[PDB]
């Protein structure tokens, strides 16, 4: 999702941790970025209890149709935006809500 403020593109895990740290390690601070290790997937970086958690977002296919998921298909999303919007109100597998957008 190119036009989203929480989307930082192809940056590293180290760099996302630095940005979050620089922003106060505030609980609920988050960003999404591309995954190098999982080429057409993403990583949600989320700050909770002064640590930075990293959640893998994998593409997959149902009846040919593409969806994203962090929990091996238990909870499925059309695109990154829906995943992010859902988790601003619902924890799901996350330890907390996505509360603050890390500045890109």
């Amino acid at each position: 999702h190119r036009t989203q403020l929480w989307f930082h593109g192809r940056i590293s895990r180290e760099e996302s941790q630095r940005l979050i740290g620089q922003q106060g390690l505030v609980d609920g601070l988050f960003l999404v970025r591309e995954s190098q290790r999982n080429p057409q997937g993403f990583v949600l970086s989320l700050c909770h209890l002064q640590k930075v958690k990293h959640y893998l977002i994998l593409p997959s296919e149902e009846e040919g149709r593409l969806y994203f998921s962090m929990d091996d298909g238990q909870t499925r999303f059309t695109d990154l935006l829906q995943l992010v919007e859902f988790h601003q109100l619902n924890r799901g597998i996350l330890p907390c809500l996505l509360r603050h957008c890390c500045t890109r």
Partner: peptide, 8 residues
């Protein structure tokens, strides 16, 4: 759940 990530 996935090596090197915090999912579940």
């Amino acid at each position: 759940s996935f090596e090197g990530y915090d999912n579940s």
